[PDB]
């Protein structure tokens, strides 16, 4: 008989899920499989992108249940796991979504290889990008495009991407009954406490398919807004509703279909003649995404600075002092301090208001190095993508992608284009609510009265700015301007 698994690492999805439904064609059991590695937290993780993790997994418990199936959370580590489970449930094929990432291809070679041993065949079908990502490398001549004109160049040739996948039946083959490893009390989806976390989740984003596909939906109420969409024009302050779509962290678990997104924008750009182009479409996000994905994925130690051959080597300063002021949120401005604080609160935050953090800390006012940076992203960011993580930080730090080290963004002005009222301020950083706006981007500038008066004294109530913009950005830049030659 046909007994199938089907894994899941990213693509906590049903819809466009190109491998549940080789899973469940022509199969008499079918066991969705995920594992779990019970430690981790005991080697880095926040509890925000966690929990949004286990929320996606218990949205496709529910999903599966009203399909007549159930979800299975295996403990430990999967070449442990599967050789077990391949002879006790009599599997013959093993399904689950591609992944480019490094430890993902040594991960992957290793349990393919015990597959052939237990006669179980291997389909790993392509859905986490758009296109396949080694098609673009291979019809570009063999070697990736490092710009995004270049990229944009490419994908145009290529065409279309594929559609998405057909929804999958409303019955499916239920695991075994009574197999000693599909245990209801053992395969069941743990609580952030069980797994060992003693602080409560504060993001506002909840995790799970149902709620991608509901924001989704949301985002193309207006279609007028989906056309005309253009990325650096957005808003960077706003927060009760964000100018962006939030999809971020969707896209990264897999509860959002690429090939969905994709499709939906087509239908629109239809009707919408003078819709925007890339790189500011929202079309050209997802590029962005298949940009970086494409390059990182064929570039040595991408996720590093020695070794990597498209970074720039940049003598970077160690300050741990400047850190950790940096990721504490007690750098002395407002305007950074808000950003720096929504990042441990919500995990996610504007991309121009990832710019003014990540050029701050670089580049701009303290010379630290962008991997020291990365790593505070890694554990906060819910919608954290290796990938879209180290590429992004090199484009700040001018370590690649981007060369233009004059652009130095002012921890001040920058967010008082946008919110002069410090209304993004007063919300995330509450000890500065009383303060006026004159003063809300320097309350080292307000008088000492006015001080008082609002409950905020520099230096006992809020932090002085560690250092001074006007000669830091000068020290930084002249540094930069040597490195580049
Ligand atoms: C220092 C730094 C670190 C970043 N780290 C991450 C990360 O770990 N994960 C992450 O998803 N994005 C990362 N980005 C990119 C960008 O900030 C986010 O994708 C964006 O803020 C998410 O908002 P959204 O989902 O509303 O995006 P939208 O503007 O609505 O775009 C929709 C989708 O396009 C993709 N996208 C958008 N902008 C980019 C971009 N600049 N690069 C690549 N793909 C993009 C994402 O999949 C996103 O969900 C980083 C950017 C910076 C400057
Ligand atoms: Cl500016």
Same mark, same amino acid.
Request: aromatic content about 12%; proline content about 9%; some cysteine.
């Given at each position: ?100 990432? /490094?430890? %993902?291809?040594?991960?992957? =070679?290793?349990?393919?290889?015990? &597959? #052939?041993? +237990?006669?179980?065949? !291997?389909? $790993? ?43 999958? /039946?409303? %019955?499916?083959?239920?695991? =075994?009954?009574?197999?000693?490893? &599909? #245990?209801? +009390?053992?395969?069941? !989806?743990? $609580? ?43 808003? /960077?302050? %706003?927060?009760?509703?964000? =100018? ?242």
């Amino acid at each position: 008989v046909k007994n199938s698994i089907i894994w899941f690492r990213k693509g906590l999805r049903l819809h466009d899920n190109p491998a549940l439904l080789e899973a469940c064609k022509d199969a008499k059991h079918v066991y969705p499989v995920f594992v779990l590695d019970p430690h981790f937290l005991q080697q880095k993780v926040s509890v925000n992108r966690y929990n949004f993790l286990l929320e996606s997994l218990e949205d496709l418990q529910r999903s599966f249940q009203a399909r007549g199936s159930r979800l299975l959370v295996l403990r430990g580590k999967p070449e442990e796991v599967f050789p077990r489970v391949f002879r006790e449930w009599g599997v013959t094929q093993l399904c689950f979504e591609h992944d480019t990432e /490094p430890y %993902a291809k040594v991960r992957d =070679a290793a349990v393919r290889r015990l &597959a #052939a041993e +237990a006669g179980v065949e !291997v389909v $790993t079908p392509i859905s986490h990008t758009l296109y396949d990502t080694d098609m673009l490398v291979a019809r570009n001549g063999g070697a990736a495009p490092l710009t995004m004109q270049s990229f944009t160049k490419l994908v145009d040739r290529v065409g279309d991407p594929p559609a998405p996948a057909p929804d999958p /039946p409303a %019955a499916m083959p239920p695991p =075994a009954e009574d197999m000693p490893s &599909a #245990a209801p +009390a053992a395969t069941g !989806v743990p $609580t952030w406490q069980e797994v060992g976390f003693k602080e409560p989740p504060l993001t506002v984003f909840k995790g799970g398919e149902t709620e991608a596909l509901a924001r989704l939906e949301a985002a193309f109420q207006d279609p007028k807004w989906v056309a005309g969409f253009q990325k650096p024009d957005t808003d /960077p302050s %706003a927060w009760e509703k964000p =100018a962006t779509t939030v999809l971020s962290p969707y896209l990264k678990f897999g509860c959002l279909s690429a090939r969905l997104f994709h499709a939906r924008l087509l239908e629109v750009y239809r009707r919408h003649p003078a819709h925007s182009q890339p790189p500011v479409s929202l079309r050209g996000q997802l590029l962005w995404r298949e940009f970086f994905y494409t390059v990182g994925s064929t570039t040595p130690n991408f996720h590093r600075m020695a070794g990597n051959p498209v970074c720039k080597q940049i003598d970077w300063d160690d300050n741990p002092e400047f850190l950790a002021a940096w990721r504490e949120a007690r750098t002395g401005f407002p305007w950074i301090d808000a950003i720096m604080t929504q990042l441990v609160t919500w995990g996610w935050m504007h991309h121009l208001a990832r710019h003014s953090v990540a050029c701050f800390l670089t580049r701009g006012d303290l010379y630290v190095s962008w991997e020291r940076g990365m790593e505070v992203f890694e554990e906060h960011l819910i919608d954290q993508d290796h990938y879209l993580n180290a590429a992004n930080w090199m484009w700040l730090s001018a370590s690649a992608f981007f060369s233009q080290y004059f652009r130095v963004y002012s921890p001040v002005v920058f967010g008082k284009k946008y919110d002069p009222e410090g209304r993004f301020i007063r919300k995330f950083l509450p000890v500065l609510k009383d303060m006026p706006a004159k003063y809300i981007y320097e309350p080292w500038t307000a008088p000492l009265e006015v001080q008082r008066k609002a409950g905020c004294v520099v230096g006992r109530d809020y932090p002085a700015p560690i250092v001074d913009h006007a000669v830091a950005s000068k020290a930084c830049i002249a540094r930069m301007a040597a490195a580049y030659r």
